[PDB]
DNA sequence: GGGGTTTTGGGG
């Protein structure tokens, strides 16, 4: 696996969103190239791009250690994330492009140092990790095993359709509604019976770090 | 005053007009120039082969470059062989080849004419168009066609049909074999056959490609962008890249300027490639031996009589079937889905005794059930369009009336007694509920329920 | 940038 981000994000999903369960070998600092900075700050490991999430207690440090080195102008310049985290949370994939099937693996950052001796170097034009074939399927598998688990606990008793209702159907006319069956503890139309600890870390909205500077 | 590609003046500053056959073209893309560019390879009766000899099957061509300020002003080339008509095009010489340039914002204009009875668009919508002189797509608000052009158009069609039927337009040099994919520094073209179209999600499809090299690759194709992609059709991918960061599947990455072109019926290349390239299922049978399979495996095969029948979504099948005036008329449907849970949970209870005269089924547990042996399996399925909701739909496999009896390829029998039959069904049960396992079935509607019929497992 | 890389960031 040549993509550092694809291995990371795949590992997280295959471990129920537990950043602890993922191998401590991948905990190492990530020196990655910055593709964009505004309207969307997108970083790249050389193969794919992801939208990192800065802390309102992390950019303060960035200005202290690197005064006047504006973050919005970091485009096309390498950054090194020292301490980072990987959260998982439900979102609306129709409004957030850095997600898939209402699920997003966020790259939380706490400390990042800009390395100036870096130029253009991506091995290819970077693509959205959440648009990749294998990775989109990795998430499909995640929701599959979660749906299959929530289904085997909700639907009980082997409630089969009475064969009489299907025999000599001619004189019988029915509504398709009958076939529909709720998959889990319904709290709306959206299936949400997941067993992962959702991320609840307050993050900096890209607009703030722009107007702030 | 239409000029011919090879006879076009390379010096006269006077804009030239012409008719031509499109053999290749990129998808209209955007540049930071706030300009939308569209590049295509055009050919006509004067410029088509290398000009060295017939051995050089390598088709010589002229390159047409269109510039616009809006996406809607550029032509979307889905098929190769169709005719394009350019007005006010300036000719230039770029690296040995004749390059025609056109600014559709200033004075240039174009018009696309279909070489076949129906164009790709009016072929999907099942539209009927016997108007052979009208273009299916043109640059501006109005398109004029004099009676003099008719002779040119109808003769250029005859030539196109003869050119494509006697020559493999897309020569060996304009594409790379799939087994050489990882050896290319970057950008490369591919002429393959669509072995399988998988509806990954709401917006994207997944094409299972295979060319003469024997290699099998996968690629993500958007629905809105490429709606002409069908199973069994030979296509040409304009711009592809080998996905180095894909370990379980051989993947091809496409860009916004990339294009999937199909050929006109007369095509010799597409014709030969449809026959010479068959599916192997080697990828499928291999993936089935793995816990987590990243490859989609269509477990079933629909009867030959429903092979032409279109596939209706599970959402339409269950949420719109009682409202939509078109779905109320139909009784038989075709659909694709994935089984989440199978009921009864006990495989042995899948086959029960059935009374014809009473219409009631009974268990063969204590072998007390004296009725005829029938299947009474109930599938709780899910769809790609249903992927996000908190629902699961009921699809039945009740074989009392002969519907879907041959499904498991094993005839109904007392599962409590026949061990052979039990094992076979137990194997299929874990196969159906397994991730990435899909069912392509045909269903008959009875009293508000859907029954599997004329469908069977092939694994 | 014509054999090219936008944002509409799942036609562009």
CB A120 within 8 A of CB B338: no
Q: How far is CA A142 from the centre of its chain?
A: 12
CATH of the domain at A147: 2.40.200.10
Q: Which domain holds residue B111?
A: 1-174
Q: Calculate the CA dihedral of residues A45, A51, A52, A54 and round it to 10 degrees.
A: 150
- Residue B402's region, left for phi above 0, alpha for psi from -120 to 50, else beta, is left
Q: Which domain holds residue A196?
A: 1-213
Resolution (A): 2.8
Domain count, chain A: 1
Whether residue B140 is found in the same domain as residue B224: no
Nearest-angstrom CA–CA distance, B438 and B435:
9
Q: How far is CA B308 from the centre of its chain?
A: 14
Whether residue B18 is found in the same domain as residue B90: yes
Whether residue B161 is found in the same domain as residue B251: no
**Core vs surface per residue A179-194: b (16+ CB within 10 A) or e:** bebebbeeeeeebbbb
Whether residue B317 is found in the same domain as residue B378: yes
Across the interface, whether the CB atoms of B359 and A164 are under 8 A apart is answered yes
Cis peptide upstream of residue B344 (ω within 30 degrees of 0)? yes
DSSP of chain A, one letter per residue? ---HHHHHHHHHHTTTT-TTTS-TTTTS-EEEEE---SSS--EESSSEEE-EEE-TTTHHHHHHHSTT--GGG-TTS-EEESSEEEEEEE--TTT-TT-BTTEEEEEEES-EEE-SS-----SS--EEGGG-HHHHHHHHHHHHHHHHHHHHHHS-S--PPPGGGTTTGGG----GGGGEEE-SS-SSSB-----S---------TTHHHH--
B190's tokens = 């591919």
- Which residues of chain A lie closer than 8 angstroms to B218, CB-CB? 133
Nearest-angstrom CA–CA distance, B263 and B24:
10
- Angle of helix A4-13 versus helix A133-154 axis, rounded to 10: 0
**Measured between alpha carbons, how far is residue B98 from residues B3, B42, B112, B404 in Å?**
14, 10, 21, 61
**Measured between alpha carbons, how far is residue A161 from residues A77, B76, B360, B361 in Å?**
63, 50, 12, 11
Domain count, chain B: 3
Domain boundary among B290, B311, B326: B290
First vs last C-alpha separation in chain A: 38
DSSP of B378-420, one letter per residue? EEEEE-SSSTTBSEEEEEEEE-TTSTTGGGGSS----TTT-HH
Whether residue B193 is found in the same domain as residue B86: no
Across the interface, whether the CB atoms of A176 and B322 are under 8 A apart is answered yes
Q: How far is B204 from chain A (nearest CA, A)?
A: 9
Whether residue B257 is found in the same domain as residue B270: yes
Nearest-angstrom CA–CA distance, B362 and B355:
8
| Angle, alpha carbons B34-B37-B39 (nearest 5°) | 170
B414's tokens = 């007392």
- B224-CA/C6-C1' distance, Å: 17
Whether residue B5 is found in the same domain as residue B117: yes
SS3 of B260, please? strand
CB B99 within 8 A of CB B65: yes
- Residue B281's region, left for phi above 0, alpha for psi from -120 to 50, else beta, is left
User: What DSSP element (H or E) covers B302?
Assistant: strand B300-302
Nearest-angstrom CA–CA distance, B436 and B286:
13
B205's tokens = 């499809």
Nearest-angstrom CA–CA distance, B240 and B449:
44
Q: Parallel, antiparallel, or unpaired for β A48-50 and A127-128?
A: parallel
Q: Parallel, antiparallel, or unpaired for β B16-25 and B97-103?
A: unpaired
Q: Which residue in B241, B318, B388 is closest to A179 by CB distance?
A: B318
Nearest-angstrom CA–CA distance, B279 and B126:
28
Whether residue B286 is found in the same domain as residue B397: no
Nearest-angstrom CA–CA distance, A180 and A182:
7
HEC per residue, B127-143: CCCCCCCCCCEECCCCC
Longest dimension (CA), chain B: 96
User: What DSSP element (H or E) covers B273?
Assistant: helix B268-276
A45's tokens = 């490991």
Across the interface, whether the CB atoms of B398 and A166 are under 8 A apart is answered yes
- Which residues of chain A lie closer than 8 angstroms to B378, CB-CB? 160-161
Nearest-angstrom CA–CA distance, A117 and A33:
12
SS3 of B17, please? strand
Asked if B137 CB < 7 A from strand C, the reply is no
Q: Calculate the CA dihedral of residues B221, B224, B230, B231 and round it to 10 degrees.
A: 40
Q: How far is A61 from chain B (nearest CA, A)?
A: 34
**Among candidates A104, A56, A105, A52, which has minimal Cα distance to A82?**
A52
**Among candidates B348, B361, B355, B354, which has minimal Cα distance to B414?**
B348
Q: Calculate the CA dihedral of residues A135, A105, A76, B242 and round it to 10 degrees.
A: 0
Whether residue B121 is found in the same domain as residue B210: no
Whether residue B297 is found in the same domain as residue B167: no
Domain boundary among B265, B290, B315: B290
B29's tokens = 């893309």
Domain boundary among B240, B265, B290: B290
Nearest-angstrom CA–CA distance, B435 and A143:
10
CB B368 within 8 A of CB B356: no
User: How many C-alpha atoms does B273 have within 13 Å on its Cβ side?
Assistant: 27
**Measured between alpha carbons, how far is residue B400 from residues B8, B35, B120, B396 in Å?**
73, 64, 43, 12
CATH of the domain at B198: 2.40.50.140
Whether residue B45 is found in the same domain as residue B27: yes
Answer whether B328 touches A (CB < 8 Å): no
Answer whether B436 touches A (CB < 8 Å): yes
Taking residue A10's Cβ as centre, other Cβ atoms within 10 Å add up to 21
With tokens 């909701």, the residue in question is B389
Across the interface, whether the CB atoms of A137 and B294 are under 8 A apart is answered yes
B 373-392, residues with C-beta < 7 Å of strand C: none
Which positions ≥6 away from B340 have C-beta within 8 Å? A144, A147, A148, A151, A183, B380, B381, B382, B392, B433
Nucleotide C11's nearest residue (CA vs C1') is: B225
With tokens 């690296």, the residue in question is B95
CB B41 within 8 A of CB B23: yes
**Nearest nucleotide, C1' to the C-alpha of B76?**
C11
Whether residue B72 is found in the same domain as residue B115: yes
Q: Parallel, antiparallel, or unpaired for β B97-103 and B216-222?
A: unpaired
């Amino acid at each position: 696996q040549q993509s550092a981000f694809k291995q990371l994000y795949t590992e997280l999903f295959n471990n129920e969103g537990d950043f602890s369960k993922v191998s401590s070998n991948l905990k190492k600092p990530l020196k990655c190239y910055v593709k964009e900075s505004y309207p969307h700050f997108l970083v790249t490991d050389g193969y794919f791009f992801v939208a990192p999430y800065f802390t309102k207690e992390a950019v303060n440090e960035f200005h202290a250690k690197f005064p006047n080195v504006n973050i919005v102008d970091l485009t096309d310049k390498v950054i090194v994330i020292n301490n980072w985290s990987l959260e998982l949370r439900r979102v609306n994939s129709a409004e957030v492009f850095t997600s898939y099937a209402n699920l997003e693996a966020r790259l939380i950052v706490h400390s990042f140092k800009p390395n100036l001796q870096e130029r253009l170097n991506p091995t290819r034009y970077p693509v959205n990790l959440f648009r990749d074939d294998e990775f989109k399927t990795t998430i499909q598998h995640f929701r599959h095993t979660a749906l299959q688990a929530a289904i085997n606990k909700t639907v009980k008793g082997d409630n089969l359709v009475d064969i009489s209702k299907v025999a000599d159907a001619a004189g019988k006319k029915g509504k398709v509604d009958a076939g529909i069956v709720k998959a889990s503890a319904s709290k709306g139309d959206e299936f949400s019976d997941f067993s992962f600890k959702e991320g609840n870390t307050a993050t900096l909205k890209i607009a703030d770090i722009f107007v702030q500077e | 005053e239409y000029v011919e590609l090879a006879k076009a003046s390379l010096t006269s500053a006077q804009p030239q007009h012409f008719y031509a056959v499109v053999i290749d073209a990129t998808f209209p893309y955007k540049t930071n120039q706030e300009r939308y560019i569209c590049s295509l390879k055009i050919v006509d009766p004067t410029l088509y082969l290398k000009q060295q000899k017939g051995a050089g099957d390598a088709s010589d061509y002229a390159t047409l470059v269109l510039y616009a300020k809006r996406f809607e002003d550029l032509p979307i080339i889905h098929r190769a062989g169709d005719i394009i008509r350019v007005h006010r095009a300036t000719l230039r010489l770029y690296n040995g080849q004749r390059q025609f340039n056109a600014n559709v914002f200033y004075s240039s204009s174009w018009a696309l004419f279909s070489t076949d009875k129906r164009s790709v668009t009016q072929e999907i919508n099942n539209q009927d168009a016997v108007s052979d002189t009208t273009p299916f797509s043109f640059s501006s608000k109005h398109a004029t066609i004099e009676k003099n052009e008719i002779s040119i158009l109808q003769n250029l069609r005859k030539w196109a049909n003869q050119y494509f039927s006697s020559y493999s337009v897309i020569s060996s040099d304009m594409y790379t074999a799939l087994n050489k994919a990882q050896a290319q520094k970057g950008d490369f073209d591919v002429v393959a056959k669509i072995l399988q179209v998988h509806e990954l999600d709401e917006y994207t499809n997944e094409l299972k490609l295979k060319d003469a090299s024997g290699q099998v690759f996968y690629t993500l194709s958007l629905k809105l962008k490429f709606p002409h992609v069908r199973t069994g059709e030979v296509v040409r991918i304009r711009s592809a890249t080998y996905d180095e960061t894909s370990t379980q599947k051989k993947v091809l990455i496409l860009s916004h300027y990339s294009n999937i072109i199909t050929f006109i019926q007369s095509s010799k290349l597409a014709k030969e490639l449809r026959a010479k390239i068959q599916d192997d299922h080697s990828v499928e049978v291999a993936s089935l031996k793995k816990n987590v399979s990243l490859n989609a495996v269509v477990l079933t095969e629909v009867d030959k009589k429903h092979a032409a029948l279109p596939s209706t979504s599970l959402q339409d099948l269950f949420h719109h079937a009682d409202s939509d005036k078109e779905l109320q008329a139909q009784d038989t449907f075709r659909t694709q889905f994935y089984v989440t849970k199978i009921e009864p949970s006990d495989v042995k209870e899948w086959v029960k005794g059935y009374d014809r005269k009473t219409k009631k089924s009974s268990s063969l547990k204590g072998a007390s059930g004296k009725g005829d042996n029938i299947f009474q399996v109930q599938f709780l399925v899910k769809d790609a369009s249903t992927q996000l909701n908190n629902n699961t739909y009921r699809v039945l496999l009740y074989t009392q009336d002969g519907l879907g009896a041959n499904f498991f390829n094993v005839k109904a029998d007392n599962l409590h007694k026949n061990a052979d039959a039990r094992k076979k069904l137990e194997d299929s049960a874990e196969l159906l509920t397994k991730f990435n396992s899909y069912v392509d079935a045909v269903v008959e509607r009875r009293n508000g329920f859907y029954l599997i019929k004329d469908t069977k497992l092939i694994y």
